[PDB]
Amino acid sequence: MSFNANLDTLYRQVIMDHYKNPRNKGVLNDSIVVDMNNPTCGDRIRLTMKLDGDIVEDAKFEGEGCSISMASASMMTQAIKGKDIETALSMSKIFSDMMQGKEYDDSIDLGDIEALQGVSKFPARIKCATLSWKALEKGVAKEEGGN
């Protein structure tokens, strides 16, 4: 194939490490219920979280669609499930800081960024990059505190 291929393995290990985990069928309403679908494909994911303050204490995710979308979300949610609000706001600031600074997450936990960096930038995956990442952003992220 005349492509970089640099994404396949990334999300392969992503969908594979997550296979060890529960799948892409979980939803709750103890806090916030985030839903995002890409009508262009069939891509849809639901990040339902449980944040009793400024911490994500639980997060259940439902996903169906492209192999990368349902993979990146469920992997990074599994990682996000163990974060705080400030940290995840930083994950969104980091997503913004990456493309300009060349560095990214000082913790190197990039479950979504790794999988979606290749997604975010294809005309065929960009609507899915809004699907997955922006939903993840709409879950506990914002990039900027408000400035």
Among 76, 128, 135, 140, binds Zn ion (CB under 5 A): 128
Q: What is the rounded distance in angstroms from the CA atom of residue 70 to the CA atom of residue 74?
A: 6
Indicate whether 41 belongs to the interface with Zn ion (CB under 5 A). Answer: yes
Q: What is the rounded distance in angstroms from the CA atom of residue 127 to the CA atom of residue 119?
A: 9
Annotated binding residue 43: yes
64, containing H or E segment: strand 58-64
Distances (CA, A) of 10 to 5, 6, 88: 10, 7, 21
Tokens (6 digits) for 23: 């799948």
Q: Which stretch binds Zn ion (CB under 5 A): 28-36, 43-51, 82-90, 133-141?
A: 43-51
Give 38 or 48: the residue with its C-beta nearer to Zn ion: 38
- Tell which positions 55-84 bind Zn ion, by CB under 5 A: 66
Indicate whether 45 belongs to the interface with Zn ion (CB under 5 A). Answer: no
Annotated binding residue 8: no
Give 15 or 56: the residue with its C-beta nearer to Zn ion: 15
The answer to whether the CB of 118 falls within 8 A of the CB of 14 is no
Q: Which stretch binds Zn ion (CB under 5 A): 51-59, 72-80, 122-130, 135-143?
A: 122-130
Closest approach, Cβ 138 to Zn ion, in A, equals 17
Close Cβ partners of 122 (under 8 Å, ≥ 6 residues apart): none
